[model samples]
Target: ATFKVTLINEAEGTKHEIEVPDDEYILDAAEEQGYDLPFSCRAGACSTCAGKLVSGTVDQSDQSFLDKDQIEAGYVLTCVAYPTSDVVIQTHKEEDLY
Candidate 1:
């Protein structure tokens, strides 16, 4: 099933919601909906797409930037994150980890 993801865009000072398929990454889906979310490395290594999960779960297993503790604390790299459940995340805060 597709998951509803709400992205809090601090840069634009606006929030937008997008539906993400189980196998699709949040960024790509958002892009499909005509929104350019923050991202640098399409891979999970760079934390340029880091966002703090405000209210849901995701399968962020493809990333290597955040550690177990960080992951547990609701941090995720949108480039590689697959939505496992409806989620809300605030963008552009990788500096807290990186």
Candidate 2:
């Protein structure tokens, strides 16, 4: 099924809507839509794809990107992110990422 992805740059208040496969990762969805995202490893290893899970659940079958603190802080790794339902995500800027 095709899922609706709402990408929000919280600081900038920039919102981008993307149509993507339900099983596709957020990073892939962004790139597929021609977004110049600052990504390093495609895998969920690096914290480059980290963003906030504003409103939604995800099935991180890989469990590769996130950590305890991050998850608690609503930090989601777009590289391994797969929405369990419709979701709203907010991307943190360079200074905001922790």
Candidate 3:
């Protein structure tokens, strides 16, 4: 399924809108559209691509860094996240995840 994704970089005061395939990672999909999202380990070992999910849901099956509570609180690793529904997220949340 195709899902709409909104990425907010509050520090930079920017908001990005992009379409993502449910089967594809959000970061990869964003990059394919020329978005320079923050990321280090594309494998999701680190929190570099972490973001706060303002709304909606994603399949975070491949990420291991976050615990159950973190996921419940809406934290996600865009590098490994696949949109399960249209989502709105605030990026650059590496510190918040910790």
Candidate 4:
């Protein structure tokens, strides 16, 4: 099933919603919604797509890019973010992630 995700641009708290197939990566979904989510790699190997999941759930279908601490801290590489439920995300907060 498709799910809705709201990306709250951390720069301003501006939220945009994207509806995506369950298997769709969050970066693709963000781009589809016309929100510029920074990413250097689509394979979850870079931190450019780094962001915080402020609420709700996301399963890193692949967690190659995130270290154990980042994962524990809720840092997700949007390049591989596939939501398990409706989610709210804070974008452009790479500084908040370590």
Instruction: Identify the candidate with maximal TM-score.
Output: 3
lDDT, residue 80, candidate 1 = 94
Off by over 4 Å in 2: 93-98
Measured by C-alpha RMSD in angstroms, how accurate is candidate 1?
Answer: 1.3
Q: Taking the tens digit of each residue's C-alpha lDDT, what string does model 1 give over 6-68?
A: 989676798988899999999899899998877887999888888998998888778988889
Q: Which portions of model 1 show Cα errors greater than 4 Å?
A: none
Better of 3 and 4 by lDDT: 3
**TM-score of each prediction:** 0.91, 0.83, 0.96, 0.89
Report lDDT (Cα) of residue 33, candidate 1: 96
What lDDT tens digits, residue by residue, belong to model 4 across residues 4-97? 8988886785878889778998889878778778878778787888888788788895868788888877788888889999888887776775
Candidate 3 structure quality by residue, lDDT tens digits, 1-98: 89999999999999989999989999999999999888887997899999999999999899998999999999999999999999999999998855
Winner of 1 and 4 under lDDT: 1
Worst 10 residues of 1 by lDDT: 89-98
Residue 60 lDDT in model 3?
84
- lDDT score, candidate 1: 0.88
